[model samples]
Target chain A: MYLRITNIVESSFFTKFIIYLIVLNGITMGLETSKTFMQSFGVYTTLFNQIVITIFTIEIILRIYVHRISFFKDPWSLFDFFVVAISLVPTSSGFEILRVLRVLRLFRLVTAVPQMRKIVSALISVIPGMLSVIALMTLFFYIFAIMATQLFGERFPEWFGTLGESFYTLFQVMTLEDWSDGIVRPLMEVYPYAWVFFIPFIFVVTFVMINLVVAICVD
Target chain B: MYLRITNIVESSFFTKFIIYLIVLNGITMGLETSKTFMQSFGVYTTLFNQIVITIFTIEIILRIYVHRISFFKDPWSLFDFFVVAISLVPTSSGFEILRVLRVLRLFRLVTAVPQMRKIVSALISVIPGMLSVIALMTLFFYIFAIMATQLFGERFPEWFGTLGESFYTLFQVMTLEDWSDGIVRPLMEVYPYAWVFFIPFIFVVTFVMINLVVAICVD
Candidate 1:
C-alpha cells in the first residue's frame, strides 16, 4: 500500500498537475486584485480558489500517506505543507490578514521548478561568506556614522543629527537611489567639500564592500 | 636598467611606500572635505595634493619607462595610468568637476591592495550569469508592467498610468522602501486584491529575483 502511494505521488504526471494548479491559482488570485475582473467573475474566482485549495490538500495528504512518519523530513515538503496549511486558515472577516496570506500559495511553484530550487540552493550556500561581508559592512557603517554625526551634526541636524539617522542616511546613499542630487549635493553646497567625505564613503561602503560580498559568494 | 627598475617597483619597499602614500592621500582628501579641518590646515591640503600628484606622476612615468609599450598590456596598469592621467587635469575655477574626479585616484587602492583586486575579479567573473538574471528580471518587469497598466491604468494613473510609471513604481516596490504603507496600501483600498498583484510581485521579483542574482553571481 505504501509503495503504491509512493509511486503515484512521485510520478511525473502528478508533478505537472501541481505546477499547472499553481499557475491557475496565480492567475485567479491575480484576478481577485482587480475589482472589475472580480465583479464580473466573482463566483468563478471563488469556485477556482476552493477547487485549487482542495487539490493542494489532496496532494499533501497523499504525500504524507506515502512518506508516513518521515513526511516532513524534506524542507520542500514542509514548505508545501505550511503554505497549504496557511491557505486553510479560517479567514473570516476578523481574520482578513489570513486571507491576504493565501496568495503565497504561488510560491509552491518554486519547489516545483528545478531552476528556482537550484537558485535557492545557491543562495543557501553563500551564507558563510555573506556573513563575513555583512560583518565588515556593519563595522564600516558604525564607524562612519559616528564620524558623520560628530562632523555634520551641527549643520545638517535632520540627516546627521544623531548616530542612528547618519547610519540610515548612509544606507540610502549606498543604494545610489538619489544620493547625489537628493542628499550629497545639498550637503556639498554648505560644506563645499562634503563629496570628499561621501564619495569615498560610497566607494568603500557601496562599491568595494558590496562587490566583496558578491565576490565572496561567487568565488 | 629597465629590468632593474621593474625589480624595484615590484620590491617590498616600493610597495610599502606606495601604500603609505595612498593612506596619506586618502586622509588628506578626507580632511579637505571638512570646512573646519580645511580652516586649520588649508595650506596642508594644497601641499598634500601637490606632493601626491607629483609622486603619482613620477610613479606612472617610471612604470611606463620600465614596461615601455608593454605597460599598457596589463588592464590594471592601464587603469592606473588613466586614473593618474585624470588627476593631473587642471581644475581651474569652473572645472570643479575635474577636481572631483581626482578622488578616483583613491580607487587605485584597489589595484594596490590584493584583496580589493581579488574582489573585482570575482565581480567580473560573475557578469555572465548576472547578466542572464538581469535579462530575466527585465523580461518579468516588461510583462508585468504591461499587465499592470492594462489592469490598473484606468484608475490609478499615477502609478500604473503608463508603462514607464508602472516600471518606476514597481522598482520602488521591489526596494521595499515604504512599499506597503506608501504605495500598496492606498491602491488596496480601492482594489482590495491589489496586494494579490503586489505581494506575489515582490516575492517573485524582489525576494526571489534579487537573491537569484546574488546566488548566480556568488555561485
Candidate 2:
C-alpha cells in the first residue's frame, strides 16, 4: 500500500495535480492576503492552513515511501524530511517559528523536476573553466584596484577614493561601460599619465571578459 | 597608386599594427591620466596627442587610397572614415572633446578579429530566443507585480511596497532564493491562505527562468 501511494505520487498525474494545486493556491492566497477584510475570517484561516499542511504531509509521505528507508541516504532528502517533520512540532502561539520550514517544501518541487537535474549537470560540467575564469578576473580586479587607488585616491576621493572604488570601477569596465570620466577624469586633471594603468585595466575588462566568457561557454 | 595603398591598408599587417598602436596608446593614456603630476607637462600631452592624430591621419589616408570611391559601398568602412575625419577637425579648446571619438576605435578592433566575428555570429543565432526569453521575463515580472500589489499591498505595505520592489523580490525568487520570509510571511500573517498565491509565483520564477536561459543557450 505504501509503495502504491508512492508510485501514484511520483506519477505524472499526481505531479501535474500538485502543480495545479500550487498554482490555484497561489491565486487564492494572493487574493485573500490582499484583502483587509479576509483577516477577520478565523475559521477560513484555520481551514486553509490545515489544507496546506495536509497536502504537504501527504507529499512528504509519498516521497519517503517511493524512495524507501534509504531515502535518508541522500543528505538533501534527509534535510527535506527533517524540515517537514520539524514543522509538525507543536508550538506556542507567540513562538511559532517553524513556519520558516514551509519554504523548504519548494526544494522538493525543484528536485522532482528532470530539467533542474540537467541544469545541475551542465553547471557541474562547466565548473572547472568557470573557476579558472573567476580566478583570472579576481586577479585582474585586485591589480586594477591597487593601481586605481594609487592614481585617483587623492583627486576623486569620492569615487576612486580607495581600492574599493577602483574595484567597483573595474567591475563597471567589465560590463563595457566608459566610467573613466566619472572615476578617472578628475584624477587625470591632477596626474595625466595615470591613463596608462587605467587603459590596460579597461582593455582587460572589455576584451578579456568577453573572450573568457565565450571560452568557458564553448569549452 | 591609390588602389594599391588601399589594398595594403586592408592587409592583415596594417590591422595588427593599428590594434597594437591603440593598445600602446591606451596604456600610455591611462598612465598619464591617472598621475597627479603629469598634468604639468602640457608639452607631453600635446606630443602624445599629436602622435596619435598623425597615425590616425595616415590610417585614413591609406584607407581612402586603397578603397578609393568604392569605400562608401561598405558601411563599416564608411563609418571608419567618417569617425577618423570627424576627430581630425580643428576647433577651439573644446575641440579636444572630439578625442572621445577614440572610444569608437574599439569597434575597429572588433572588426579586425576573426574570433570576435565568430562570437558575433554565435550571438546572432541566439538573438531570437534571447529576445523571447527577455520578453517572457518582463511579462512574468509585470504580472507578478500586479498580482502581488493587488493581493498583499494594503496589509503588508512594507513588503509589497511598490511594483518596482515587488519586481526586485521576484528577481530574487528567480535566483531560487527562499525570499518568502521577506515577502510572503507578512502576507500569510494576515491571511494564512495567502501561501497559495506566493508559492506559485516562486515556482514560476525559479523554474521558468532557468529553463528559458538554458533553452536559449542550447538553441
Candidate 3:
C-alpha cells in the first residue's frame, strides 16, 4: 500500500496536476495585479489563490509522506518546499521584498519541465570555465572603469563622476546599447580623445572578454 | 627557395614584430579618438598609420607570394587581406560608418593568437545547436510582446503601448536589468497582478530561452 501510493503520487498524472496548479496560481497572481478586474473579482481571485496555496501545501505534505526523508534530499523538492513556505510568512508593511518571493513560486516550472531541467544541468556544467573568464571580465571592467573615472571624470561628471557610475556606464557600453550614439558621440564634443577610453573598452569587453566566456562554454 | 621566405616569416622574431605592429596600430587608433592627442599628434599619427598600412601591405604580399594560391585558401589570410584592404578606403564624409571598420582590424589579434583562434573555432562549431534555441528565443519574445500589448497596452502605455516598446521592455526584463524595480513595481501600482505576466515571462525567457541556448553550447 505504501508502494502503491508512492507510484500514484510520483505518477505522470500527479505531476501534470501540479503543473496545472502552478499555472493557475500564476493566473491568480496576474489577476490580482489589475485594479479594474480585481474590483470585480477581487475576493474570488484571492480566495482561489489561497485555496491553490492550500492545495500546494497539502500536495507538498503528500510528497513528504510518500517520499519520506528522501524528500528533502532532492534539490527541486527543497526548492518547492521553500517557494511555498516563504508565502506562509506574515507579510505586511516593511516586508515589500518578501512579497516578491511569491513570484518565485513560478520557478516550479523549471523543475517540472524535463527539457528545462536538462538545460539547467548543462549550464551548471560550464560553471568552471565561466568562472575563470567572468573573473577576468570583472577585473577588466574595474581597471577600465577607474581609468574612465580618472580620464573623463572632470568633464563627463554624469557618466564618469564616480567609480560606481563609470562601472554602470561601462556596462551599458559592453551591451552595445547605444554606447556610441548616446554616450560616446556626445562626450566627443568636449573631449575628442574620449574614443581612446571607449574604443578599447568596448573591444575588450564585448569582443575579447565576453566572447571568451561563450567560447569556453562552447568548448 | 620558396621555403626561404617562409622560414623567415615563420620565425618567432618575425611573428612578434607583426604582433607589435598590430598592437601599435591599435594604440594609434585609440589615440586618434582624443582631441588633444589628435590635434598635436594628428599628422604624426596619420603618417605612422600609413606607414603601418604600407608594412602590412608588404607583409601580405610576401605571404601571398610565398604561399602562392594556397594563401587565398586560408581563412585567416583572407581576414588579414580584407582588414588591411578596408582601411585603405578614403574617409572624409558620407563614409563615417565605414570609419568604424578600422577598429575591426584589431580582430587580427584573434587570428594571430593561437588560443584565441582555437576559441573562435570552438564558438563557430557550436553555432548549429545554438541556432535552433536562438530562433526559438525570438519566437518567445514575439509571442510575449503580443500578449503584453494585448494585456497591458491600455493601462501601461509607456511599457506595453506598442509591440516595439514591448520588445525593448522585454529585452530589458530578460537581462534582469532593474526589471522588477524599474518596470514591475511601478506598473504593479495600477496592475497589482502585473507580476503575473512579468514573472512567468522572466522565467520563460531568462531561464528557458537563455538556458537552452547555453545548454546547446555547453552540450
| Best by the lDDT measure | 1
Per-model C-alpha lDDT, please?
Answer: 0.77, 0.62, 0.76
Per-residue lDDT tens digits for candidate 1, residues B20-99, read: 99988998888899999888999978987888899888888887887788988998899988998888877777678888
**Which of the CAPRI classes, incorrect, acceptable, medium or high, describes model 1?**
incorrect
| Tens digits of per-residue lDDT for model 3, A1-219 | 778878978899999998998777766665555567768998998778778778888889889989888989998889989988976665567655456566667767767877666645655565566677679888988998998899888988877889976876676676565677778999999989889878877776767644754575456
| Model 3 segments more than 4 A misplaced | A1-8, A65-69, A213-218, B1-157, B160-168, B171-219
In candidate 1, stretches whose alpha carbon ends up further than 4 angstroms from where it belongs are A68-70, A92-97, A142-168, A188-197, A213-218, B1-157, B160-168, B171-219
A133-167 per-residue lDDT for model 2 (tens digits): 66987887888688777767776765567786566
Fnat of candidate 1, please? 0.09
CA RMSD of all predictions: 16.3, 17.8, 16.1
Q: What is the TM-score of chain A in candidate 2?
A: 0.61
Model 3 chain B is weakest, by summed lDDT over 10 consecutive residues, at B202-211
lDDT, candidate 1, A111-139, per-residue tens = 78787676566555655665776798889
Please give, for residues B1-219, the per-residue lDDT of candidate 2 as tens digits.
Answer: 766776788788888988787776666566656556476765676578668768978887777666678877875677667766765776346657676665565565555567876787677777775554464456457656655655565676665656666677667655534444344444656876665665566545644554555566667
Candidate 2 Cα misplacement greater than 4 A, ranges: A1-5, A25-54, A68-110, A115-124, A146-166, A189-191, B1-160, B164-219
Candidate 1, B112: how far from true, in Å? 46
Higher-scoring candidate on TM-score, 2 or 3 = 3
